[PDB]
Amino acid sequence: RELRDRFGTYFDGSMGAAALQKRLESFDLDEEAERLREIIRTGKGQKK
Amino acid sequence: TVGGLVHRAVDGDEQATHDLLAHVHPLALRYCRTRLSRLPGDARHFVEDLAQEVCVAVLLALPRYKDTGRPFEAFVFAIAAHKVADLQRAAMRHPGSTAVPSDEMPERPDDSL
């Protein structure tokens, strides 16, 4: 509540499955697959 | 104190309504639990479902809650008792719908063979 009162209009927040729906809509998979391929190509131990 | 909260809520203060209902809801939950736990049937799985109704009742009683020196706790614990009684009314009437899939599927055959 403090954050929303102080510096609102820059970030958007939510609770429950609405937040997940917004992320799954906005989030695109190509770039994520790219970084995952980068890290698996050069990874150590559990992280890979 | 609850008194100022109810005063601002009947006035129409949204923050006061929020803060007062945030206190009403735990009371409604506790009362619905301690009643419905000991009653027969599957009423125990409606405790929360009743609490929300109790809160809804309060949400529609504040606009005309003419105070008479009665604490708001009394108002909530009267509404909760009435809702519990209404659930009992709905339960005891014709308690024939038994949710047993071991008779409809295995024991009851199709009418057309």
């Binding site: - | 209902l21 929360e48 479902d49 929300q52």
Partner: protein, 96 residues
């Protein structure tokens, strides 16, 4: 069927949520109702995954839509591989 009870729970909580939205109820009440609707659909799809199960007439758990597919008595392992059949009989066996 238990599915009727679970569908009734989800429809109850959905309608109560719609009412609460219409009245402009505070954040806490709408949040509680939305959480309850989430748990209701969760019980509809799988009663036992999270929390306590929703019991039916007795203390036994209710049957979820996914509980009707798995297990020994599920659809696959009781009705699609092994079926009761017509033109069949049985009796005790004696030596001729």
């Amino acid at each position: 069927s238990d599915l009727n009870d679970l569908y009734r729970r989800v429809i109850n909580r959905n309608n109560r949520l719609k009412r609460l939205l219409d009245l402009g109820a505070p954040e806490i009440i709408v949040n509680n109702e939305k959480r309850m609707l989430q748990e209701a659909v969760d019980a509809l799809f799988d009663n036992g995954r999270r929390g306590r199960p929703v019991t039916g007439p007795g203390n036994r758990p209710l049957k979820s839509l996914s509980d009707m597919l798995k297990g020994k008595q599920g659809r696959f392992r009781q009705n699609l591989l092994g079926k009761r059949v017509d033109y069949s009989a049985r009796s005790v066996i004696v030596v001729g």
